[model samples]
Target: AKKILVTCALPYANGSIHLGHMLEHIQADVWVRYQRMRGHEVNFICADDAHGTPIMLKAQQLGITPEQMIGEMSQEHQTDFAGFNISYDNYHSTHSEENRQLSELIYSRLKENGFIKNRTISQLYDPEKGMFLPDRFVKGTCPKCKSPDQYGDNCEVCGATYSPTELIEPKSVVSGATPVMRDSEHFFFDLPSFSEMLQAWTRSGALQEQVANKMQEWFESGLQQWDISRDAPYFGFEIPNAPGKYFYVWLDAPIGYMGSFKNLCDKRGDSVSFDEYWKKDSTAELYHFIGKDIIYFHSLFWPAMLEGSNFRKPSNLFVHGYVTVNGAKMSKSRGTFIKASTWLNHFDADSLRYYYTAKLSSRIDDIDLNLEDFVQRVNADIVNKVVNLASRNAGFINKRFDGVLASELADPQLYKTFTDAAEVIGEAWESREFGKAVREIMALADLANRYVDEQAPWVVAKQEGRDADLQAICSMGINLFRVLMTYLKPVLPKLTERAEAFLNTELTWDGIQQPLLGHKVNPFKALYNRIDMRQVEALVEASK
Candidate 1:
């Protein structure tokens, strides 16, 4: 079995967990669960990105310390993820001691190796807020298009990129103050120095073609030395031997992945595994699941940072796109910005999980959670198609056969057809082609329901002296249920457990070839229930 380390990007600590965050987490969780089922050693790690200027200012507005605020948000974040059954091996924080130590160590190594540089640069400073304003923190008329309220970095209307100082009549977002130029000494990571190495890695087919194209564009535009330091009043780790200067949030956030894993090692009393997984020479695979919005950070800065510090870089970057609701970007006024906690109140975790899996593919395409489609798909695929097999067949076995499966498969050929799909479906999941996997599984579900319909077990139950035939027919259906649930085990975890109880057997990838022969099965409640538009309406109302 291969050793693997997987991570989703850290959730920013300033906000509530929303459906947008759940999209990436769910994507990673599905892949991780599938790997574990295949007997690979996988450690899933994540953390709260707890340090940033926004966090510090938000805490002040709330009349709380930054530590206290992050603590509360972290608990809330973890709770939401747990509610959705995100099986994280370690969930930690960027504000942790483990992260601090890792950040300092990497910085020191890079500085020692002459990969770090220092320069004085001018940036917009908010006089009233008494702090430097990041590009996004300033707003003004776009120099190119004369568009009002454009951010400092780029014009949304004209798509022109410029420095904050180039904006006309720039105002600070925090205090509405007219900003002034201020100079500060900042440390930078010489990212341009790694151009050849990054280009080679990009072209080596480690990245998706789309991502590689984006990297090529960045290369064409020319890579620059990355700014790695922030001035005083920042809420982050201070740079060593540089008083009143702090590491930028971007600089320390990715290090949180290492920090979270180190924390796991400490908790489990397994000191050696950390190095075994992260050492420069280790064979363990590392993968990061991130949104396309942050591709620049994870793809470029993160890899460069790791290589500069003499550590193993990510083996692959699994990039996903945004989540849109009702065919549009989530809107606060429209109440489409559904929070994760709010989602759990109306729907089971399995519903959203199945819905997303059916729509996700190996591309960075934006996923649309059309509420109408969500209701129809879950009810049809899960309730009516997949669970229908067990719900329709279990009664006959319990009443007539004393809850026992048939001594042999009624249709061995049909069972083989289901078993034959393991390879193709498994490959789909392995390659992160989730939509393809789901379609294949659902097609099998369609076939299972057809078999039961043909057997007409309800008609068999009525005929006198038809007990043996009834047992064979119903048992075949139940075994089919077992196989489908096993295929879907990673996608719908809670439902898998219930199906397990009904079958009286644990599901495994390799065990499908052996049919349950005269096995004693157990009774079950509804394996899954139908969802409808009323619930969808309620969810939308609640979100509003």
Candidate 2:
């Protein structure tokens, strides 16, 4: 059996879970669920990127240390994620002992291998706050267009990227004090050294095409030495053997994946040979799901870290797009910048899971969740097409025939469908084409509905000689439902279970591709309630 390991980009612990975060988590969760259903030995691992500027800022506001803030935020994040049905095998924090040990080991190896170096640089220091300002900590005028209020890195109005020091007037968002240029001892990782090796890996198709393009663009423009260690006043893993120095958050963030794997192995009494998953021989295929904005970190910095530490490089990196609410970037003014819990109070979790699976593909395109589109897709696809197929057929089965699948399906359509849909659906998933899989599965649902209309089971059952023919119609319904549930097991597990009980079939890949007989079947109930305009409008209002 092939060992599969999956990781999703960890959300920072400074804030609430938003729609943008859901898109990546849902996509990875669906894939992992599919793997488990396929009977693959899978490890789905991720954790919180809890060591960053935002966490520090929030900690100060709460009159606590960043460590205390991260601890509270991590638990809240897990609760929110569970509500969305995202079952991560392990969710560890970057501040754990496992991470610190492994991060230092990797850093030491890289430094010894001539992959790391030190550099001195000017930093923004806020004397009033008694800290050096990370770029995100300060805001100033846009140097390009003179946009009065903008972030330190780029002008949201002019879309120009410039250094914070170039701005006319720079003030720390933390202390509201003017930041002065100050000198600090910073450690640098020489990214330029790996350009040739990274390019080779990219051209060999080791990385996604989009990420490859982006990395090439950056390298050609000149790769800068990354600042690896930070001065005092930052909250992160303290550098080993170096007092007052800390590993920058990004430097240690990726190590959380390995730390999580180590944690899972330890808890389960598995052997502590966790190195094979991340470092050894590339047998366990590594796939990362991250947003497009963080392309450089995953493709460039992550690979450099792995290669420098002599770990297995990523086999494939999947870059996905963002989430825009109501056709615009999620905005507080519009009240569409929804928190996870806010949306959960009104909608079914599986609805969002299926919706994102249908929208996300291998291509790096942002998925939009227009309120109208969300309601329309759920009503038209899940409620109308999938659930309606079973409801319209199971009702007849319960009244006329025993609530069981036919012993043998005589109709060629009934016999061949299980194999046919299974073949297509399996292929789509193997290619990571979830959108296509959902489409083909819905096509099978359409077939079920069409068979019902043509057979006209309500009318066919009237004649005494047509008993077996009516049974055949019911058999086709049962068989079709089983086939769909098998395909959909990865997306909607509970709905699939309901489908199995209604069809008297076991919930398994093999069972869904076969027939069941004589086991009791339940009366049809509404599996997925149709989303009306009113319900959707109410949810939208609640988001506000």
Candidate 3:
């Protein structure tokens, strides 16, 4: 078994967890759970990215300190994640002392290795707020397309990149005051010095091929030095010997991975060494799950920091696209931007988890949450197909036969078909090809359901002397149901738990090899309910 560590991108502390956030966490958690079922020692961790200009401003508006704001938000985040069963080994925060120490350590190493530089640069300053503005906080008319209210860095309309000073009539979003140009001495990381190393690493199977191809564009354009420090009024760890200046949110956010693992090790005691996983040339595998929008950060800056600091780079970086609803971007005004709390109020978590797995693949294409299709797919595949097998056969075992399975194999060949399918399904899980696995599972479910229909077990029950035959038929059907549940355990964990209770056996991959013989099963209950349109409408109404 391989040792693995997995992480989802830290959610920003300024907002609640939404469906878009759930997409990445659910995707990564499925893989993590699959690895665990495969008997791999996996550590899954993430943190709240608690530092940024937005957090500072949000806390100010809320009449609280940034620390207090983050503390409350962290609790909300943990609650939301638990509701969705994220299964993180540890969910720490970037505001923790552990992250502060790691950020300082990494920065000091970069400085010692001559990768730190300082230069005076023109920046947008908000005189009303008495602070320097970050790129996102400044907005003005786009120079390229003349689009009004564009951000300082790039235009969403024409996609042109420009400095804040180039915008016509730029205004600070913080206080709606006109921003003025000011010069400041900023600390920058020597990002261009590692261009050669980055080029090689990007092409060395560490990234998806499409992601690597995208990185090539940045390479051809030539890398620039990255500014790693922010001025005062920021909420982050202070840079060493650079009072009043703090490390940028991007600088410490990725290092939060190491900090989180280090915290976990500290809590678990001396046997778990942080160095064993992070030391260069270490055997442990590392993975980072992120959205496609942050490719440059995880692919470029993150690796450079780790490599320069004598730490191990990521083994692979899996990137996914944004989540849309009903073939459109989730819009607040349209009442489609549903939060995690909002979803839990209306539906079960396993339904969404199974629905996402049915649509998600390793490809970086965006998945739309088509409400009509969602209700149909969940009801058809899950209710009518997967869970129907248990509802139909379990009654016979529990009522007529004292919940005991048959003594001998009724259909050994059908059982073989399921065991053979496990190899392909296991590979799909290993590669994070969840959509493929879901398709295979549905197909098996259909096959098993067809067998039950053809045998007409209910008709056999009506026959006077066919009790043994009915028992054998229902027994085979229940065993097939057991196999399907084993295949589905990772994606729908709650269903798996209920399935274990109903079948009265521990579900595992190895359990698929042997069919239940004379085993007593408990009475079955409804595993999941059909999704109603009224509930969906209610969820949207509540969001509004």
Local lDDT at 189 for model 3? 95
Write candidate 2's Cα lDDT for 1-544 as tens digits: 7788889998888888888898889888888887887888888888988886667778889999888888888998898889888878899888888888889999998889997777778888999988898787888898889888786788899899988988768888888899998987878887888888787887997566777788778878987789899877777888877888899999999888888888888888888448667765767788888899888888888888888888987778888888987788988767788888887878878888888888777778778888888889988888877877677767667777767556676566555865667777887777678899999888877877777788888888888799778877876776666667778888886687677766655677776544655545788668778776677666667777
Q: If candidate 2 were superposed on the true structure by all CA atoms, what would the RMSD be?
A: 2.3
* Regions of candidate 2 where Cα sits further than 4 Å from its true position: 139-162, 166-169, 461-468
Location of the lowest summed lDDT over 10 successive residues in candidate 2: 511-520
Clashes of 2: 0
Alpha-carbon TM-score of each model against the true structure: 0.96, 0.94, 0.96
RMSD of each: 2.0, 2.3, 2.1
**Superposed Cα deviation of residue 317, candidate 3 (Å):** 0.4
Colliding pairs, model 1: none
State the lDDT of candidate 3 residue by residue for 1-544, as single tens digits: 8989999999999899999999999999999998998899899999999998889889999999999999999999999999999999999999998899999999999999999999998888999888998889999999888999898789999999998788988999888999898888899999899999999998788578889889999999989999998999888989989889999999999999999999998989945468889999789999999999998999989999998999999999999988999989998887799999999999988988998899898888898898888899999999999999888888877889999999986889988998899999999988889999999999999999999999998899889989888899999988998999988888998998999998888898888888999888899668888998888889888988
**Candidate lDDT (C-alpha), each:** 0.93, 0.81, 0.91
Q: How many steric clashes between backbone atoms does each model show?
A: 0, 0, 0
